[PDB]
Amino acid sequence: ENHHVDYVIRFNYGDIDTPEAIKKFEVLLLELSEVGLQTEVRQGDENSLFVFVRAASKKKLKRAVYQSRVRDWLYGVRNTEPEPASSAKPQSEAERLLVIYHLITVPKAEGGAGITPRHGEWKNVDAIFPLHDEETNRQCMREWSKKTFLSTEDLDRIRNTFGEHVGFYFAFLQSYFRFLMFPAAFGFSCWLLLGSFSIIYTVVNCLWCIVFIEYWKRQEEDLSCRWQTKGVSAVHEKRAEFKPEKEIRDESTGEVRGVFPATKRMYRQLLQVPFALLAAVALGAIIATCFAIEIFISEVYNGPLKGYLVFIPTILVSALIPTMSAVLLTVATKLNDYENYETQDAYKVALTQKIFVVNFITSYLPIILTAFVYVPFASRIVPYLDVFHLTVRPFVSKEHAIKARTEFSINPDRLRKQVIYFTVTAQIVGFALETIVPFVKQRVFREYKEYTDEDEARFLTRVRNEAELEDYDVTDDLREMCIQFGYLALFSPVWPLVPVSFLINNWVELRSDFFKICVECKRPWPQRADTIGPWLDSLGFLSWVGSITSSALVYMFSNGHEGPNGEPTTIRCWALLLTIFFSEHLYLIVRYAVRSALAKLEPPNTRRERIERFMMRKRYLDTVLSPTERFWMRQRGWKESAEVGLSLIT
Amino acid sequence: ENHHVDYVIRFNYGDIDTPEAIKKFEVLLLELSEVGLQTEVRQGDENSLFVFVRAASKKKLKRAVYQSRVRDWLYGVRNTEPEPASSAKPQSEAERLLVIYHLITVPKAEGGAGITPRHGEWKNVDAIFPLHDEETNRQCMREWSKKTFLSTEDLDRIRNTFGEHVGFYFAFLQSYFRFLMFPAAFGFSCWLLLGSFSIIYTVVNCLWCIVFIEYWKRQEEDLSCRWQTKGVSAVHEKRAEFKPEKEIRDESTGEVRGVFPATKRMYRQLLQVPFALLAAVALGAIIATCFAIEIFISEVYNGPLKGYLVFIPTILVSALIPTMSAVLLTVATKLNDYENYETQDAYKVALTQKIFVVNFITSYLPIILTAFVYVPFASRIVPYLDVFHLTVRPFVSKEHAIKARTEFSINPDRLRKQVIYFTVTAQIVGFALETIVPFVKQRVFREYKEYTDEDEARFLTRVRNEAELEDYDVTDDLREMCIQFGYLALFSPVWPLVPVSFLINNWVELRSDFFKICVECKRPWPQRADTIGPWLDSLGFLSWVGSITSSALVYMFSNGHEGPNGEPTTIRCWALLLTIFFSEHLYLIVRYAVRSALAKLEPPNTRRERIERFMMRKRYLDTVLSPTERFWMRQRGWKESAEVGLSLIT
Ligand SMILES: [Ca+2]
Ligand SMILES: [Ca+2]
Ligand SMILES: [Ca+2]
Ligand SMILES: [Ca+2]
């Protein structure tokens, strides 16, 4: 059905001249041939060729699979000895696709073709992608669209098709959804019986966050052992953009390495603090200014055309936060390039960590402003917001803009409504923008280009359609789930139905993300992983911060949703600070206890890998490696000493 | 000089009858013979026999050394393949002593004699100890009593004589002493230029604590790799008191294990929280009551005989804290037995962790009471201390006991004097009680018993003298150094010469502890370790708590040593809490940054062990282990595809 194709290499010739294009193309085909791959060339687009790649021989494929397994075993990623090359069948499509992707991409010295798409020698090579298995995808979709949980076999199927990175994301999402049943039930019970800002709800929520994060750390270790990816960072793919200072030739492996000093990288990484403060200043200024405009227009201004003016600040936010975030992403990418980052995974993790500052600010600063600035203050702030009258100055006359005032009186529904928005309406709108609109845009761009050799015209047209799809990044889905967890950890006391909303959304999220991968995206090459990465630390940080924000909220809103109704008078700053101190430190103590208790419970795959390391070393040992003297002359054997002892005893 | 003796086994017959003593002694000698050891029996004391133990054959010793190395390698403690048994010489005296100690003590099923001193089958066996190498000890003492730092070779000598546990203690002490030069110089500079309660001193002190602890974690990893003890917990010696529930026979090693459920142990370990609260209540009650008596007698009471009454509370503390601590140690030992603890190291670590609560309370609660109870309060507390007049009631008449009052006026030198005591006078008195008085007591008890065969009478008399010496526990010295670090981390802003005192004391402490080990204690058997153990976590906790206490002190005593002179009026509780919040979280952020920066700097022995694991697996691999088809039929080799691409581009 896929015509035995492993990868499609898109070669762009449109932006270059014919002689250089022909020379580069011949070089590409020669490298593919010399690395043991079979090529077929077809017209991809009007400006690109499709190089269809396949293992040229079953023997060569078995040899490459065996060498990949041997490299994994040598670097300790697996403990079982690699089976001989005659029995080296790819145990899944993900393994064959990974071996062939490495053959195409790893440098010539490392034993492959050095095709680095969108890099120096290969800027014409635009994309290297495998083909979707449409029947398997549709079977999986229809099968687990009718179940509650995905089986371990279902997760293994995802891993065997899309690799362990996508597999880890779906395993984490399934575990998060399963753990969300407890907070969903408990928060519905609290919303029914206690209402919001309940001490018992906040305590149980913090405890649940602790338990889920520690459980997932343990489960990640277990799953990376079960998928044979534990310690996979030892064989992380280098990135071709890495600029080494000197070239050193280690003696263990007869190769030059290209060293770069770690301390110099740390000096360059000092710039992350200024980047973070820049992003905080810019994004917080935009968000707080739009919040002040929103407050003025919606609650201070009392002139004509109030809806058409209250839609102003939401528009400005929706236009300016994406733009400022794109600028900050450009700055973060330039800083990530300045830091050198030998490996692609290190580069990706560092960029994700820089972007997490922007994510935190844009996701949580609105609710933080409403909760800890608008509610306690803003009876003392709205006198300073008369200056924002000019935002309504263009649409209404100067006198009507001035005579539009009333007692400010803070809205006690503002915070609950903002939390309900971010945890329900944002979820629905994000589902729409994430699955529906890209799908419709793809179908529209297809029928636009489709409206205005005979035996492979269908396969080739569907390959040309797959070539237009989006490039799936599992980091985006992990980011979304971690930001959602942050909402739960930080602001769930405001509205205890947040975990119910997240439970429903995450059940739908598994299926809709799988659909997006299978239908709206090119099939990702089966990248490996032994963890969700920096997102685990992000979740730990969010839960820590939530222990502070939730306790602050429970203190401030003890008297109800109004709490300090605009005035900071009722808030005793020492009692708020003491609440925060004891809550955060009870959090840290309970987290330490839970982590230490879970460290005493070794999971089965982890114990099996430890025992297997022992057994491998035992096999190795079994196959290879196969005056003063007058003091001791007094009592010959153990019996003479026994009689001397008897004589001394009696 | 030691007559080739490896171990001396002290067999006590005094508390049993002659037939049972003879039977037990014959069983002991038979086990020693059957495990390959040569025995010689002499009269140890009037109530004990000395069994002198030696490897019966150089071949048997080489075989036992080879088997020990093979076990270490199989469990991953070392990565280099064990050399053959014909080249299996003990590379140090510590290795031979460890192999022979294991031969004597590990159970019969594990391949040794099952002699467990002071246990069921062996309650008569009182002690198993090696003999000191007096010439080597005296050479080391005289050699590094004349140097500033001990060389890496000196530390290796300590490890090669006394094992890696003692070696880790001395390495930690040397590193701590070396790092103390920075705080000593900086604190002397601050005491000269700024005085006490300086913000810059407190900041620099917290930063130094962070850096030293993270550096020592890194150095512990490096040193355990250099001493081939990394991961030594995989071969931790089991403890004979362990009560298994079921007996399971794992298939990897053909042996029964004796499983006990970890969750049941965790249930039993829940009792540690009640023990900790009990110890806190009892010790804090004693300490606070004696502090109130001290305050009343010294500053409220103004009658006759004031010195003979002010010595009352110090006496009561010195008598009651040791007694209450012995009771709490009995309770902690019973709780440690209730928890089952398969291995001896786990038992020891758990008992040390239970005792650390008592250590923290008794070491720091006096200064904490003075700093955060006596200074802010105690103008509002001394009205409640008239009830303590009865403590002076026995020595003075009732009227003289009543008419002994004056304005309370808190002493502004109390806190500085208490800190100076705990950091200088306690150090000197502890040096005395630790080295001088045990030495003199030993010499006195010797000449008492020495006052009121001909060729080995000197060796035998010195073995009988060594048999009386104390049993060295390196945990005591680690406890002392960690409590000292706690004083530095918690209360150094009060008096910035604390690190100078600790620098001098720790230089003397290296030499005096080595002297105590070599002269006042039996030679410890060469127990292994890859860390100082729970004391690293204790240091981290103490530095964390110090970030809170030091910032609180700097806030409270901004106006000088008087600070809040008895009244809590000048202390703004929100400003104190905000100071604590920002100080502790700046601490945690800086600690995270320093830990992450140090994780990027792999030390040489660590990198060497990783590369050696790779090389060992490479040696193992080198010795053993040696319709759709019409799509691909269009272009045969890389050249036909090249011409198809050329025509398509044209
Ligand atoms: Ca979504
Ligand atoms: Ca998603
Ligand atoms: Ca000492
Ligand atoms: Ca000592």
**Residue entry with tokens 């991809």:** A44
A581 vs B: CB within 8 A: yes
Backbone breaks in chain B after residues (C–N over 2.5 Å): 452, 626
User: A620-624: which pairs have CB atoms within 8 A and are 24 or more residues apart?
Assistant: A620/B81, A620/B620, A620/B624, A621/B70, A621/B73, A621/B74, A623/B623, A623/B624, A624/B620, A624/B623, A624/B624
Cα nearest neighbour of B31 on chain A:
A638
B467 vs A: CB within 8 A: no
**Residue entry with tokens 């393949």:** B81
Q: What SS3 state is found at A51?
A: strand
Give dist(CA B536, CA B543) in Å, integer: 11
Give dist(CA A313, CA B348) in Å, integer: 64
Q: Which chain B residues have a beta carbon less than 8 Å from that of A250?
A: 611
For residue B644, give the nearest of A13, A41, A621 by CB distance: A41
Q: Is the dihedral of CA A476, A482, A486, A487 positive or negative?
A: positive
- Yes or no: say if A4 and B632 are a contact pair by the CB < 8 Å rule: yes
Picking from A174, A185, A85, A210, the residue whose alpha carbon sits closest to that of residue A500 is A185
254-293 in A: which are within 8 Å (CB) of B?
Answer: 262-263, 265-266
Give dist(CA B649, CA B641) in Å, integer: 12
Side chain identity at residue A455, one-letter code:
D
Inter-CA distances, B503 with A631, B366, B388, Å: 47, 23, 41
Q: Which chain A residues have a beta carbon less than 8 Å from that of B611?
A: 250, 252
Resolution given for this structure, in angstroms: 2.3
Q: Which two tokens stand for residue B264?
A: 């049941």
Q: What SS3 state is found at B471?
A: strand
User: What are the φ/ψ torsions at residue B231 (nearest 5 degrees)?
Assistant: 75, 20
Side chain identity at residue A440, one-letter code:
V
Picking from B228, B231, B213, the residue whose alpha carbon sits closest to that of residue B598 is B213
Distance between Cα A112 and ligand 1 center (Å): 38
H/E stretch holding B52 reads strand B48-55
CA distance B3 to chain A (A): 5
Count of pairs with CB atoms under 8 A, one residue in A, one in B: 191
Q: A451, exposed or middle or buried, with CB in 10 Å at 0-12, 13-18, 19+?
A: exposed
Distance between Cα A173 and ligand 2 center (Å): 10
CA distance A642 to chain B (A): 6
**Across the interface, do B649 and A25 touch by the CB < 8 Å criterion?**
yes
Q: Which chain A residues have a beta carbon less than 8 Å from that of B70?
A: 621
B450 vs A: CB within 8 A: no
- Name, in order, each residue with C-beta under 8 angstroms of A311's C-beta and a sequence gap of 6 or more: none
Task: Give bridge partners of residue A471 from the DSSP assignment.
Answer: A522
Q: Is the dihedral of CA B444, B449, B452, B453 positive or negative?
A: negative
Q: Which chain A residues have a beta carbon less than 8 Å from that of B63?
A: none
DSSP code for A86: G
CA distance A572 to chain B (A): 9
B593 vs A: CB within 8 A: no
Picking from A197, A188, A237, the residue whose alpha carbon sits closest to that of residue A501 is A188
Side chain identity at residue A518, one-letter code:
C
User: What are the φ/ψ torsions at residue B305 (nearest 5 degrees)?
Assistant: 60, 65
Q: Which two tokens stand for residue A35?
A: 């690395």
**Across the interface, do B638 and A577 touch by the CB < 8 Å criterion?**
no
CA distance A14 to chain B (A): 9
Give dist(CA B498, CA B491) in Å, integer: 9
Answer yes or no: is A513 a known binding residue. yes
- Yes or no: say if B523 and B470 are a contact pair by the CB < 8 Å rule: no
The b/e string for A405-435 (b: 16+ C-beta within 10 A; e otherwise) is eeebebbeebbeebbbebbbebbeeeeeebb
Give dist(CA B479, CA A458) in Å, integer: 77
For residue B638, give the nearest of A39, A628, A649 by CB distance: A39
Distance between Cα B472 and ligand 3 center (Å): 14
For residue B22, give the nearest of A262, A639, A649 by CB distance: A649
Report domain extents, chain A.
2-650
Q: Which chain B residues have a beta carbon less than 8 Å from that of A618?
A: 74, 252
Q: Which two tokens stand for residue B395?
A: 């020595």
**Across the interface, do B70 and A456 touch by the CB < 8 Å criterion?**
no
Q: Which two tokens stand for residue A12?
A: 């762009």
Strand pairing class (A470-471; A521-522): parallel
A22 vs B: CB within 8 A: yes
Q: Which two tokens stand for residue A464?
A: 């040309």
Cα nearest neighbour of A19 on chain B:
B646
**Across the interface, do B18 and A649 touch by the CB < 8 Å criterion?**
yes
Picking from A275, A173, A274, the residue whose alpha carbon sits closest to that of residue A223 is A173
B648 vs A: CB within 8 A: yes
B618 vs A: CB within 8 A: yes
Alpha helices in A339-436 (DSSP H): 344-369, 398-402, 414-420, 426-431
Experimental technique of record? cryo-EM
Distance between Cα B475 and ligand 4 center (Å): 9
Q: Which chain A residues have a beta carbon less than 8 Å from that of B266?
A: 597, 600
Q: Which chain B residues have a beta carbon less than 8 Å from that of A33?
A: 637-638
**Across the interface, do A581 and B578 touch by the CB < 8 Å criterion?**
no
Q: Which two tokens stand for residue A618?
A: 């035992």
Q: Which chain B residues have a beta carbon less than 8 Å from that of A632?
A: 3-4, 38, 40, 54
Task: Give bridge partners of residue A256 from the DSSP assignment.
Answer: A249
Q: Is the dihedral of CA B576, B577, B580, B586 positive or negative?
A: negative
Task: Give bridge partners of residue B7 from the DSSP assignment.
Answer: B53
Q: At what angle do helices B474-491 and B498-515 cross, to 10 degrees?
A: 180
B645 vs A: CB within 8 A: yes
Q: Report every protein residue that has its C-beta within 5 angstroms of ion ligand 3.
A: B 430-431, 434
Q: Which chain A residues have a beta carbon less than 8 Å from that of B634?
A: 40
Distance between Cα A484 and ligand 2 center (Å): 11
Judged by its nearest atom, the ligand closest to the C-alpha of residue A432 is 1
A11 vs B: CB within 8 A: yes
User: B602-606: which pairs have CB atoms within 8 A and are 24 or more residues apart?
Assistant: B603/B218, B603/B219, B603/B221, B603/B222, B603/B225, B604/B222, B605/B222, B605/B223, B605/B225, B605/B226, B606/B221, B606/B222, B606/B225
DSSP code for A434: I
Give dist(CA B342, CA B264) in Å, integer: 13
For residue A623, give the nearest of B456, B614, B624 by CB distance: B624
User: What are the φ/ψ torsions at residue B485 (nearest 5 degrees)?
Assistant: -60, -35
Q: Which chain A residues have a beta carbon less than 8 Å from that of B614?
A: 74-76, 252
Distance between Cα B516 and ligand 4 center (Å): 9
Answer yes or no: is B83 a known binding residue. no
Q: In sequence order, what E strands does B478-619 have? A: 521-522
* B123 conformational bin, left if phi > 0, alpha if psi -120 to 50, beta if neither: alpha
**Across the interface, do A632 and B40 touch by the CB < 8 Å criterion?**
yes
Q: B267, exposed or middle or buried, with CB in 10 Å at 0-12, 13-18, 19+?
A: exposed
Interface probe with B: pick from A9, A86, A625, most Cβ of B within 10 Å: A625
Distance between Cα B477 and ligand 3 center (Å): 8
For residue B3, give the nearest of A4, A21, A631 by CB distance: A631
